[PDB]
C-alpha cells in the first residue's frame, strides 16, 4: 500500500472451559514514511493517533529488522 | 440529512453493514457551494458578491462561498498586503471543470489582479518575477483560506520554487 504497512499483532486468549489458549491474530494498518523504510520481519510500534483514514488510525515509530526470515511463531511484542 | 456515517461505507473486508438506526442530524451534510466570481459586472447588475451565514450545531455561524469575487493577498516577502478583486480561478487542480464556473476552493491557484499591488515596482526589483507579474496585472497565488466553512477570500502570494513548479504548468501546460 502506498506509504502504508499492515502489521499483525497476536493475542493469546484464555478460555475458561478449557484452560488451553487460542492464538487469535489481528492485522492493523498505520502510516510509514520514507524516512524509516521497513524490511519484512521487523518489530514496528504503532502510536494511537488521530483517526487518519477509514482504516488508518495508527502511525509507525520504531523499526527493528530481524535477520533472514522471521516467519511468525505468534509472538506478541 | 446527506449523512457522513461509517456504517454507510463498506467494511474493510467488504462487509455491507445494515445501518443500526436511521441517519442523524449531527452527522448531517450540506450543499457543496459553487462559488461565483465576476469577470466584469459591466451592463448587468443582477449579480453582486453576497456571502451566506448558515444554521449549525451549537448555534455556530458559518460564512460561505455564496458569491465572492473581491480578493486579498499579503506578499510573504514584504509582509504588507493589498486588497482588490481577483481575475478568476485558474488552477483548481482537482478538476478543470471547476475553473470554468470560477468555483473557488481552499488554496486553489488563481489569476491575481494588481490594482493596488502595482506599488511593488517602486521598491527596486523586489521579486522580479512578481514585478513582471504585478505590472501586467496578472499574477499566480493560492487563496489559502477556507471558503465554504468560513467565507474567507484572504490568501497567500505564490513565491518559491513552488511557484516555479506551478508556473511550468501555468505557462504552456
Amino acid at each position: 500500500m502506498q506509504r502504508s504497512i499492515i502489521v499483525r499483532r497476536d493475542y493469546l486468549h484464555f478460555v475458561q472451559k478449557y484452560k488451553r489458549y487460542e492464538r487469535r491474530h489481528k492485522h492493523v494498518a498505520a502510516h510509514l514514511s520514507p524516512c524509516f523504510r521497513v524490511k519484512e520481519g521487523d518489530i514496528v510500534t504503532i502510536g494511537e493517533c488521530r483517526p487518519l483514514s477509514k482504516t488508518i488510525r495508527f502511525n509507525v515509530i520504531k523499526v527493528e529488522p530481524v535477520s533472514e526470515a522471521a516467519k511468525k511463531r505468534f509472538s506478541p511484542f | 440529512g446527506i449523512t457522513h456515517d461509517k456504517m454507510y461505507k463498506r467494511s474493510k473486508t467488504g462487509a455491507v453493514q445494515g445501518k443500526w438506526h436511521k441517519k442523524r442530524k449531527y452527522n448531517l451534510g450540506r450543499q457543496p457551494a459553487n462559488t461565483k466570481l465576476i469577470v466584469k459586472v459591466t451592463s448587468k447588475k443582477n449579480e453582486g458578491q453576497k456571502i451566506s451565514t448558515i444554521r449549525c450545531r451549537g448555534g455556530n455561524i458559518k460564512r460561505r462561498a455564496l458569491r465572492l469575487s473581491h480578493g486579498s493577498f499579503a506578499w510573504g516577502s514584504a509582509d504588507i498586503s493589498h486588497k482588490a478583486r481577483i481575475l478568476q480561478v485558474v488552477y483548481n487542480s482537482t478538476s478543470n471543470e471547476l475553473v470554468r464556473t470560477n468555483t473557488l476552493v481552499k488554496g486553489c491557484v488563481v489569476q491575481i489582479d494588481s490594482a493596488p499591488f502595482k506599488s511593488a515596482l517602486s521598491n527596486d526589483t523586489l521579486d522580479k518575477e512578481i514585478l513582471d507579474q504585478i505590472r501586467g496585472d496578472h499574477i499566480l497565488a493560492r487563496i489559502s483560506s477556507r471558503p465554504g466553512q468560513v467565507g474567507t477570500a484572504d490568501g497567500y502570494i505564490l513565491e518559491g520554487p513552488e511557484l516555479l513548479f506551478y508556473q511550468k504548468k501555468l505557462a504552456p501546460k
Binding site: 493469546l12 486468549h13 478460555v15 472451559k17 478449557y18 488451553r20 489458549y21 487460542e22 492464538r23 | -
Partner: protein
Amino acid sequence: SGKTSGLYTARKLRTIRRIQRWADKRYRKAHLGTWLKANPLEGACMARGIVTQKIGISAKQPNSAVRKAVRVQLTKNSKKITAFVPRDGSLTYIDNNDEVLVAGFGRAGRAVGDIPGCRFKVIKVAGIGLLALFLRKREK
C-alpha cells in the same frame, strides 16, 4: 480416545464440542430447532381448537381394547392431530366440533405407555374441564 491436549489447543476442543454436541437424540431435539416447527403443538402446554372425526385406535399387547380418541385441528397452525380422551367412558360427552384443548403425554413426543401411535392427550371440551365432566364435577 486419542485426546489432543496442549496449552494452545482451545480450537480442536471448541469445534469438537460444538460438532459432537449435536449427537444426542435429546440434544438434537432441543438444539436443531426442528422440534418447534415439527411438533403439532407449537411448544406449548395447551392448544385451543375445534374437534374433527372421532377415532377408535386398536391397542397393542398386553393392552387389548380400543381407546377412543378425538382428532382435532389446532386453530393456530391449522393442522389436525389426535388427542387421547381422559377417564372411563369420557368420550360420549364429546361429539361434534367443540372447543378442545390438548396437552402433552409426558414423554413429550413418544406415544404414552402401550397405546400405539398417539402423541397428544385432550384435557378439555367446551368450556369445562373434561376430568370434571367424567366425575360430573363440572358438566353440561
